[PDB]
Symmetry: D2
Subunit: 427 residues, 4 copies
């Protein structure tokens, strides 16, 4: 007795893959019965993972494109949604630099503990849930969906296929909507715009993508799976065993045993085609934001997979006005969307906004003390016309929500917070 969490049958899963348009052109090299064999006798429901992934998939098909900014704190995601954005990007670079479970500042080389990104996903969802709870008790209808989908960095999976599986499962438990996975050797992982990258064989990354899909299937959620290739700049590969990689092997070896390979858009197109049956979106890391190179990649991939959606990193590692003029910057995302780049994001937006704004404030305070803080406060007061609410800082973090819990439990409590506050009297 008790049927809570009973797993679906293999036939139900198979019928869903056979008939739901979500799974059009999605290859699974394992079976529905393989999935059920791994589920035990109770499947935990992952509400935020399910809802986020369904919302993301529909926005990728209903909006001209979905764009996002890198968030590394929960308040930062709340402001992104308040300001109108409809998805959140969770950067692994930013987690390494300023939000991972070791407590350390790291460059983007897979140095932090592998459950760090799941913990930030959970944090972001907690923060959006609080904003949603506050808005409900305030009757604030100005944001349609506080639970914007989160797209998170799975890096190179922190090891083998089993590490990929466990990371994807942990991201789902935390409520992620989509995750991306790149074809680098995890032990030598680099930021796509850092040097010295080592690729893994094409088939090994297909194994990674298959493992990420399997973890989503076993968890019963339709997570958006994104394949990333680092072959534009990488000049090293671990092995020449894969026949699709051999055209680019030069035969030269390094002291460590790696193989030198010829980099460029050509191996990226070849890998993207190989990954397409296994990814919902395909992403080419690139050293410069270049509309023409984007079109060449876009058109080469859609020659084979006309419906394949693409993702694009508008990266802060680029110096945007020493390779482009203002008119191209202003149309950049709109043109990319027309080539099929349906998910576009600024990875390190949060790092730069956080670091610049604290430097600016702290430098003024160093010279002029309170005059510098009053400047920022006036800018916040101004931003209230645009919908900024964090000026009322007590309600922003839920003081009114917890007052409501308190008076629900005890309508006659003499210790409520907002009653008799300096926010109630000066703001």
């Amino acid at each position: 007795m008790s049927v809570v969490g009973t797993p679906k049958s293999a036939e139900q899963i198979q019928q869903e893959w056979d008939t739901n348009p979500r799974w059009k052109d999605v290859t699974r090299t394992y079976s529905a019965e393989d999935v059920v064999a791994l589920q035990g006798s109770v499947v935990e429901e992952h509400t935020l993972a399910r809802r986020g992934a369904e919302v993301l998939w529909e926005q990728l098909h209903d909006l001209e494109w979905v764009n996002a900014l890198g968030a590394l704190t929960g308040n930062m995601a709340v402001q992104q949604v308040r300001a109108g954005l409809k998805a959140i990007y969770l950067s692994g670079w930013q987690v390494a630099g300023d939000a991972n479970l070791s407590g350390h500042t790291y460059p983007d080389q897979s140095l932090y503990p592998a459950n760090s990104v799941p913990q930030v996903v959970r944090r972001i969802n907690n923060a959006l849930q609080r904003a949603d709870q506050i808005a409900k008790i305030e009757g604030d209808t100005s944001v349609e969906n506080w639970l914007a989908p989160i797209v998170a960095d799975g890096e190179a999976g922190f090891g083998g296929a089993l590490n990929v599986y466990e990371l994807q499962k942990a991201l789902i438990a935390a409520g992620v909507a989509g995750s991306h996975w790149e074809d680098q050797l995890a032990s030598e992982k680099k930021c796509g715009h850092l040097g010295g990258k080592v690729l893994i064989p094409t088939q090994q990354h297909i194994r990674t993508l298959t493992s990420a899909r399997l973890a989503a299937d076993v968890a019963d959620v339709p997570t958006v799976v994104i394949a990333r290739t680092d072959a534009e700049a990488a000049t090293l590969i671990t092995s020449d065993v894969d026949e699709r990689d051999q055209p680019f092997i030069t035969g030269e070896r390094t002291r460590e045993g790696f193989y030198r390979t010829k980099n460029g858009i050509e191996p990226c197109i070849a890998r993207a085609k190989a990954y397409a049956p296994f990814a919902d979106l395909i992403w080419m890391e690139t050293g410069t934001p270049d509309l023409e190179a984007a079109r060449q990649f876009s058109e080469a991939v859609k020659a084979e997979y006309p419906d394949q959606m693409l993702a694009y990193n508008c990266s802060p590692s680029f110096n945007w006005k020493k390779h482009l003029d203002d008119a191209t910057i202003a149309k950049f995302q709109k043109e990319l969307a027309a080539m099929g780049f349906k998910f576009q994001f600024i990875t390190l937006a949060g790092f730069h906004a956080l670091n610049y704004s604290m430097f600016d404030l702290a430098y003024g305070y160093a010279q002029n003390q309170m005059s510098a803080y009053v400047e920022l406060q006036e800018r916040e007061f101004a931003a209230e016309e645009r919908g900024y609410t964090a000026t009322k800082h007590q309600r922003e973090v839920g003081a009114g929500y917890f007052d409501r819990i308190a008076t629900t439990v005890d309508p006659n409590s003499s210790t409520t917070a907002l009653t008799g506050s300096t926010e109630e009297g000066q703001f």
Copy 2:
């Protein structure tokens, strides 16, 4: 047979208390032998807590005053130090709101797990230590002390005197320089600029301050101990047992058994005088920024304790161009300093800089996409003249430092990170 970490003798501890000027006018109601009894057979050295506390104490006597801004991420603290600040303030409000170990957004009511602030202390010290490491390999000498002392919020101690002891011990293990403790009931704790606060008896907060000094003594570091009183606004107190509180008890008693009490500056002055023998700095929570009230509080405390240093929260819970003209705003901290307010801080500075800068960026991104980010990138480029370094983000999170480790281990490595990067090629 090793002697590493052997504890000092009671006689050496006592000499220290008797002759070191650091302990002039510090009351310890326990004995030096009581400290040794609690130390087991090994005392861990706490390098950063020791150095931070020593630097903080010297700064409070050598500078006209020490000021700080609330920091809630490691990168924030690094930019405050890069911008010239000589201390870091760690707000519990900000930890409740955006950085605690529950992962939830909370109002400032002691809801988060008790080891959350120590974890942020440790993170900030990790971040400063990386900034210091990078500066050394780069030959950067533009900041004399990267390891700025950290003053952290101990709230109401999260329980009784034993919870206070464990919190102080964890803050020291993490490297804090100073900590502050308030005379609020922990189970009903509220932001000073919140309403309906409940005070504890004067002697009970003396027990808290004594427990905080004991933990520092048992840890063998000279932590700066700050006493905060919440009596200006609180109209409730847990008990009338203490004869020093009785002049303000009305005799009315609420449904929960709290006693109503007369608030204002007179109970604050009484409590500050009771706390002075047990605190290195004294802090009155205040309901508006007001030079004349601060003057009255200062002169009343210094009539009985001329050497007592005071602390002042310049709080963001206030509207500054509301009350004050620009000239008062511009002189506010200097004026407070001449009155003995030697530690001054903006508690929620990190909350406001973070939330406003991301709202501002996301709002522009939602309308103009890349044009909004370029505006931010160009302000960052412009700030480089004032010393901002985070534009080169790979270097900023230590890619150059970890390249140095890699080539120390293997000088012939072909997988180092800065060579070939877009940061070398475009910045």
Copy 3:
């Protein structure tokens, strides 16, 4: 536009309260509308919390009684379930001593971080899920329900009603089936069998029980709520404000402001009746294991609440053969069940089993080296006839399950773990 996780209407909730026999004689002093107001626009499903609470409630009515042992690691809980037990008890004492998030060894005085017990609940559920997954791939049907319900220690809620609310919420997220709450002052919390206990007013504990029910309702799960009274040995109380508490107040007060109160079974009976409308189970902490005293308490409460179910701590803080003979010990739990004690548990069973087994092994090892280990290994081999499986330690921690994942992703993998193992070769 997604409907995933849409909250129910107040109308629906009200009807469930009015018609589900689960809620017979459960008093809620708030409204269905109050619950819906707190739920935001998405309610996360809590599968393990729902299933466990449901299974627990059914067992409490279908079995003669439910008994459990304290578990402080996931492996301990797996062995309890393997051995036949149908519930798991999660001791806060055991968490304080050996399994809390500060990493410190503490006595049972609410010293550890308030999210420690939720993390162990999550751990235990993870461990039982792994045993469930392993059982499925091995075709083992000897255990009917691997996901045994977990009853966890809420202590005194770590502060006020809002701290209770957050702890119950975190327990439910982690998958708990029931939680217990005691009428002690959190800042002076003690193990029930320690001295120096301080009660809070009867009505304050009703507020605690109400806050815990409210969190369960807002989380949409029928969590079992257990009230515990410490009035048998406590001689202090925070306040004489509650008229139900005044008959035991002696008039004498302490320097902290506490009131002496007359302890024993009589205030226990009175508090149990006051708590009965707000608790699914009622528990009296007692000073000795005594059937006569258990009968007096049971008869007194059931004289007013004939159907009220009770809980009993068979405590290791008792010296058992100093109070009872072998016959009484053998009948103890069965006699208790006939008096209405439907949940019985040995709180510190894991602490004693863990400490004794390791002392015994280590002592023999210090003397006879490998001969002592072989003794343990042969007892292990012998216990396999009773159903013990941990002697094959690789499959016990999921080597076979993760092998199945690996071959599902890539059936031709040459790096699977159990083929070639010494376990396959020697066991």
Copy 4:
């Protein structure tokens, strides 16, 4: 202007390397100035790591041999020291299976987050420090050194040389005395007695051991570095690039690009010799417990390095009486010690002691209820003559130590724990 934590000069470090016998026959391929360059301007003192490493090294020379049992909780370590052991072994296998930061049960394949073993190091040290504090206030001198050295599992580094560096640094911050490192591919890590192990080239493990020594030098502590080789059973290697590995390459390759290689004692001996200049102890993982195979390994290494100390895993993965008689079992460790195996350990002792004791208790409890627990409590009472103390569980976890803290803060407090307890009244 503080001197706390000032780094040593290069000349000072070099003089230590040249003249301290600790460093006789220790190769460092980097310079003293390289160490200094990585230290920033403050070196944190790591008291427990320094003391533990110094105690361990002395014991390895003074005792006939050092032996230990695997510990996965702090209380297990306490009992091992109370029983007379002088080192603690911290098994990664046990951390995977029941004590890692993901909360999941895992097989031994480097699946858990990379900071998990450091957290358990820190937990064990906290547990031993508390036992040391309790012993000091109880006047108990029966155990000479409560802070027994911890030897912890660094597995395969969780990635590359920078991951190794950060793990060693985290283990040292937690207080480890020694750490061991194995020549397996981290992404395909197995337990030494699982199948499907992949080796890395000899020079790559030298890189690992160099990185581990580098982190200890930068941390300014003499950590014991242990090299483990898995070449006895592994039939795969990532690359044939290293001429020392080529004699064992067969030529053929797997689908994934691995090279088949000839396993056995012969490649272990060659690897042990290559590692010896970089390891304080050397360890070959074996398939069966075999004194003459151990002699062969020992003689072979010492033919080139007569002073090289060896370590030996007395593994539970062996069925002991399916290989040896009782006389050989009885003399096994003594015989190994005479061959130079100075560190000997039972890796999974804590796993088996924990799982067996809780299975046995729960099994009796399910059938006989209190009868089963009283049998355990009686064995505990009878063990007090051998020195067992945990029967008095309140004092065991520090209730008397925290009472002393409480009475140091307030000697007249009315809320101390041990007076009035059932422990004082029944034990």
